[PDB]
Write an enzyme that holds these catalytic residues in place. Sequence first.
Site, PDB file in Angstrom:
ATOM      1  N   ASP A  15       0.740  -1.258   0.068  1.00  0.00           N
ATOM      2  CA  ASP A  15      -0.064   0.054  -0.156  1.00  0.00           C
ATOM      3  C   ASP A  15       0.912   1.130   0.083  1.00  0.00           C
ATOM      4  O   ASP A  15       0.168   2.338   0.224  1.00  0.00           O
ATOM      5  CB  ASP A  15      -0.932  -0.125   1.106  1.00  0.00           C
ATOM      6  CG  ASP A  15      -0.462  -0.011   2.348  1.00  0.00           C
ATOM      7  OD1 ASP A  15       0.814   0.248   2.713  1.00  0.00           O
ATOM      8  OD2 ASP A  15      -1.427  -0.644   3.375  1.00  0.00           O
ATOM      9  N   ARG A  29       0.827   6.829   0.217  1.00  0.00           N
ATOM     10  CA  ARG A  29       0.126   5.781   0.727  1.00  0.00           C
ATOM     11  C   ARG A  29      -1.256   5.753   0.161  1.00  0.00           C
ATOM     12  O   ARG A  29      -2.049   6.871   0.297  1.00  0.00           O
ATOM     13  CB  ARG A  29      -0.049   6.169   2.602  1.00  0.00           C
ATOM     14  CG  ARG A  29      -0.948   5.332   3.520  1.00  0.00           C
ATOM     15  CD  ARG A  29      -0.285   3.879   3.428  1.00  0.00           C
ATOM     16  NE  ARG A  29      -0.896   3.014   4.324  1.00  0.00           N
ATOM     17  CZ  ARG A  29      -2.147   2.437   4.220  1.00  0.00           C
ATOM     18  NH1 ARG A  29      -2.964   2.515   2.967  1.00  0.00           N
ATOM     19  NH2 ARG A  29      -2.779   1.787   5.110  1.00  0.00           N
ATOM     20  N   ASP A  34      -5.870  -1.290   3.501  1.00  0.00           N
ATOM     21  CA  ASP A  34      -4.813  -1.367   4.343  1.00  0.00           C
ATOM     22  C   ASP A  34      -4.148  -2.945   3.806  1.00  0.00           C
ATOM     23  O   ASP A  34      -5.006  -3.958   3.910  1.00  0.00           O
ATOM     24  CB  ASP A  34      -5.075  -1.756   5.565  1.00  0.00           C
ATOM     25  CG  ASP A  34      -3.908  -1.815   6.697  1.00  0.00           C
ATOM     26  OD1 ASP A  34      -2.919  -1.481   6.654  1.00  0.00           O
ATOM     27  OD2 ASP A  34      -4.322  -2.445   7.877  1.00  0.00           O
ATOM     28  N   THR A  35      -2.768  -3.109   3.399  1.00  0.00           N
ATOM     29  CA  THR A  35      -2.304  -4.484   3.223  1.00  0.00           C
ATOM     30  C   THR A  35      -1.565  -4.745   4.262  1.00  0.00           C
ATOM     31  O   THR A  35      -1.118  -4.136   5.084  1.00  0.00           O
ATOM     32  CB  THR A  35      -1.224  -4.338   1.783  1.00  0.00           C
ATOM     33  OG1 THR A  35      -0.287  -3.146   2.179  1.00  0.00           O
ATOM     34  CG2 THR A  35      -1.944  -3.850   0.704  1.00  0.00           C
ATOM     35  N   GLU A  37       1.596  -5.874   6.412  1.00  0.00           N
ATOM     36  CA  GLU A  37       2.982  -5.633   6.314  1.00  0.00           C
ATOM     37  C   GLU A  37       3.755  -6.858   5.676  1.00  0.00           C
ATOM     38  O   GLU A  37       3.188  -8.013   5.859  1.00  0.00           O
ATOM     39  CB  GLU A  37       3.592  -5.362   7.915  1.00  0.00           C
ATOM     40  CG  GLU A  37       2.828  -4.156   8.632  1.00  0.00           C
ATOM     41  CD  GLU A  37       2.803  -2.672   7.615  1.00  0.00           C
ATOM     42  OE1 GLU A  37       4.059  -2.550   7.445  1.00  0.00           O
ATOM     43  OE2 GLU A  37       1.919  -2.034   7.825  1.00  0.00           O
ATOM     44  N   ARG A  75       3.317  11.428   4.077  1.00  0.00           N
ATOM     45  CA  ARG A  75       3.008  10.435   3.022  1.00  0.00           C
ATOM     46  C   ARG A  75       1.998  11.309   2.109  1.00  0.00           C
ATOM     47  O   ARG A  75       1.024  11.621   2.878  1.00  0.00           O
ATOM     48  CB  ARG A  75       2.895   8.933   3.095  1.00  0.00           C
ATOM     49  CG  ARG A  75       3.924   8.317   4.108  1.00  0.00           C
ATOM     50  CD  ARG A  75       3.759   6.966   4.240  1.00  0.00           C
ATOM     51  NE  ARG A  75       2.426   6.963   5.446  1.00  0.00           N
ATOM     52  CZ  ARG A  75       1.934   6.024   5.778  1.00  0.00           C
ATOM     53  NH1 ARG A  75       2.626   4.865   5.443  1.00  0.00           N
ATOM     54  NH2 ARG A  75       0.771   6.035   6.441  1.00  0.00           N
TER      55      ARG A  75
HETATM   56  C1  LIG Z   1      -4.494   5.471   4.863  1.00  0.00           C
HETATM   57  C2  LIG Z   1      -4.231   6.404   5.939  1.00  0.00           C
HETATM   58  C3  LIG Z   1      -3.297   6.356   6.865  1.00  0.00           C
HETATM   59  N1  LIG Z   1      -3.139   7.312   7.932  1.00  0.00           N
HETATM   60  C4  LIG Z   1      -2.170   7.210   9.217  1.00  0.00           C
HETATM   61  C5  LIG Z   1      -3.010   6.135  10.157  1.00  0.00           C
HETATM   62  C6  LIG Z   1      -2.254   5.259  10.685  1.00  0.00           C
HETATM   63  O1  LIG Z   1      -1.558   5.781  11.853  1.00  0.00           O
HETATM   64  P1  LIG Z   1      -0.480   5.064  12.960  1.00  0.00           P
HETATM   65  O2  LIG Z   1       0.821   5.167  12.225  1.00  0.00           O
HETATM   66  O3  LIG Z   1      -0.579   6.034  14.183  1.00  0.00           O
HETATM   67  O4  LIG Z   1      -1.134   3.923  12.978  1.00  0.00           O
HETATM   68  C7  LIG Z   1      -1.435   4.989   9.849  1.00  0.00           C
HETATM   69  C8  LIG Z   1      -1.438   3.534   9.058  1.00  0.00           C
HETATM   70  O5  LIG Z   1      -0.564   3.424   7.684  1.00  0.00           O
HETATM   71  P2  LIG Z   1       0.184   2.171   7.770  1.00  0.00           P
HETATM   72  O6  LIG Z   1      -0.862   1.197   7.454  1.00  0.00           O
HETATM   73  O7  LIG Z   1       1.063   2.383   6.494  1.00  0.00           O
HETATM   74  O8  LIG Z   1       0.826   1.882   8.908  1.00  0.00           O
HETATM   75  O9  LIG Z   1      -1.446   5.882   8.662  1.00  0.00           O
HETATM   76  C9  LIG Z   1      -3.821   8.400   7.988  1.00  0.00           C
HETATM   77  O10 LIG Z   1      -3.553   9.281   8.572  1.00  0.00           O
HETATM   78  N2  LIG Z   1      -4.646   8.739   6.803  1.00  0.00           N
HETATM   79  C10 LIG Z   1      -4.877   7.762   5.746  1.00  0.00           C
HETATM   80  O11 LIG Z   1      -5.862   8.111   4.982  1.00  0.00           O
HETATM   81 CA   LIG Z   2      -0.162  -1.484   5.937  1.00  0.00          CA
END
Ligand SMILES: Cc1cn([C@H]2C[C@H](OP(=O)(O)O)[C@@H](COP(=O)(O)O)O2)c(=O)[nH]c1=O
Ligand SMILES: [Ca+2]
Length: 129
Positions: A15, A29, A34-35, A37, A75
């Site tokens: 993702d 991103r 959500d993929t 890890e 991102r």
């Molecule tokens: C997809 C997405 C993720 N995020 C944030 C929430 C999650 O915060 P936390 O890092 O505190 O969990 C994190 C999840 O991304 P990843 O799935 O890439 O880890 O990215 C956003 O803020 N907005 C979005 O639209």
């Molecule tokens: Ca992920």
Amino acid sequence: LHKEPATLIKAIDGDTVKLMYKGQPMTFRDLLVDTPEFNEKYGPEASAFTKKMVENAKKIEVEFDKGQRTDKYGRGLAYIYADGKMVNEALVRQGLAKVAYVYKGNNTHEQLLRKAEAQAKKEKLNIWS
Ligand SMILES: Cc1cn([C@H]2C[C@H](OP(=O)(O)O)[C@@H](COP(=O)(O)O)O2)c(=O)[nH]c1=O
Ligand SMILES: [Ca+2]
């Protein structure tokens, strides 16, 4: 929403991908998914699926939604297209991502992606197997 140009710099995982957008390198991103890890079940398969899609594309595009365009990590948040096919949707349709992180006002494609997820689940694909 509008598609805008970008070029692939490097595949990262299921993702996230590094793209050059308006001439600057950025990590993107994917909105609404959500993929797993890389270290988790289906993570390697999600990474390889996204890698093939973006590397094989003649044209990458990004489409921002109506709300925030960057997350707290810097991102880009977008729908990513490879030769006109949405990566975000294709992952969900293959059972390699779940619909997730649906924040109000950056959710234009939510119902399109939930329909893909219902289909993947009915087919028992991958994460839904
Ligand atoms: C997809 C997405 C993720 N995020 C944030 C929430 C999650 O915060 P936390 O890092 O505190 O969990 C994190 C999840 O991304 P990843 O799935 O890439 O880890 O990215 C956003 O803020 N907005 C979005 O639209
Ligand atoms: Ca992920």
